[PDB]
């Protein structure tokens, strides 16, 4: 359901299908956006339930510019996660590298479920969503270990 004041992006609701009286299905008026770029739209945005203004597959957030990748660190921020990008910096004097990283926040779309900490995520440049969020989660690639295992309870 919804836990806000209004959630209705673009699609007009009432077709007034009532010619003799029937309930029918209501999941048919759903907005479906193709992001292009050779990247597959997940089926959670097809048969989902969520309504997100800042979703790359539902909202008006266009994906442009650069495409980067990172590893997810935290989930405690609402509908957006913080990733880490480890890289090396070449130094001219000593003639070898050093580890550097810059933690960035990125808008995690709620269609990307099973987004457990440690997975390699693809991010894309968009418009500035908030003060520290500029990228947008695009595709979750790695399962970050064996999902086949199960423990007690």
């Amino acid at each position: 359901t919804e836990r806000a004041y209004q959630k209705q992006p673009t699609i007009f609701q009432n077709k007034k299908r009532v010619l003799l009286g029937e309930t029918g299905k209501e999941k048919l008026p759903r907005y479906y956006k193709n992001i292009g770029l050779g990247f597959k739209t997940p089926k959670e945005a097809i048969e989902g339930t969520y309504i997100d203004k800042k979703c790359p597959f539902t909202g008006n957030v266009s994906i442009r510019g650069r495409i980067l990748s990172g590893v997810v660190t935290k989930m405690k921020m609402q509908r957006t996660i913080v990733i880490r990008r480890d890289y090396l910096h070449y130094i001219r004097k000593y003639n070898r590298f050093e580890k550097r990283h810059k933690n960035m926040s990125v808008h995690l779309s709620p269609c990307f479920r099973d987004v457990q900490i440690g997975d390699i995520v693809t991010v894309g440049e968009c418009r500035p969503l908030s003060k520290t969020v500029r990228f947008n989660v695009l595709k979750v690639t790695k399962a970050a270990g064996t999902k086949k295992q199960f423990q007690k309870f």
Binding site: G36, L37, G38, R64
Partner: protein
């Protein structure tokens, strides 16, 4: 700074204007027009510096308002009017019909053409759109916005334009096998047949071209001007086909003299 810029330094001037270091401090800043400041050539540079018609710039400023020099059919009153690639320059008294084609080194090579070809002009389509009441518009890099062009014009095409009426004719498409001329980058003025395009989703695509005697280079789509149709250029280009051979071959040509 506040607002737009208003002057231009000789040191900050682009290299292809052949300006000096001892002559003056300020460079002639071109006025706003169809071409940007890095890919244009002013009338005072074309007259005072290149062809050597007047020694001082005040004489050029006098004659351009005494209505001798005209660009593309109509007379320009500005001494610093921009005139970029593929512009017809004619002055009204003798056979002087100059084409602003690019030299192999990147300069503006002069090219005097007969009047039967000086009447016409090629131009690259910049984009295509639709406008009021469902009519098609075409925007040219020469800042020509023309209505009802044709339905079979791709965005990166080259269309012949008439100067007397402003009518389009003879469109040529971006296809493998057409003779093109590079108008920007490190390989500007390079004339070669389009060999292989490579598309990329990052809004910029690369093109490998080949020309005669076994040479190949690469460029981007923002620096490609189609000039011919299968080793048949619609505009006669001066000093051979416009090929950079080798610096050593240039020295050998200078020794052969």
């Amino acid at each position: 700074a506040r607002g737009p810029k208003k002057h231009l330094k000789r040191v900050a001037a682009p290299k292809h204007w052949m300006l000096d270091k001892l002559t003056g401090v300020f460079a002639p800043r071109p006025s706003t027009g169809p071409h940007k400041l890095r890919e244009c050539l002013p009338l005072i540079v074309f007259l005072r510096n290149r062809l050597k018609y007047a020694l001082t710039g005040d004489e050029v400023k006098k004659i351009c308002m005494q209505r001798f020099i005209k660009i593309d059919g109509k007379v320009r009153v500005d001494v610093t009017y921009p005139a970029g690639f593929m512009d017809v320059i004619s002055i009204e008294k003798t056979g002087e019909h100059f084409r602003l084609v690019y030299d192999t080194k990147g300069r503006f090579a002069v090219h005097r053409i007969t009047v039967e070809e000086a009447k016409y002009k090629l131009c690259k389509v910049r984009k295509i759109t639709v406008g009021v009441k469902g009519i098609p518009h075409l925007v040219t890099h020469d800042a020509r916005t023309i209505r009802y062009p044709d339905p079979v014009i791709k965005v990166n095409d080259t269309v012949q334009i008439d100067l007397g009426t402003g009518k389009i004719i003879n469109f040529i498409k971006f296809d493998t096998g057409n003779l093109c001329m590079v108008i920007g980058g490190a390989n500007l003025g390079r004339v070669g047949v389009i060999t292989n395009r490579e598309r990329h989703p990052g809004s910029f695509d690369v093109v490998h071209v080949k020309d005669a005697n076994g040479n190949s280079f690469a460029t981007r789509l923002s620096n490609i001007f189609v000039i011919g149709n299968g080793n048949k250029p619609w505009i006669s280009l001066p000093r051979g086909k416009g090929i950079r051979l080798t610096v050593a071959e240039e020295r050998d040509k200078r020794l052969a003299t």
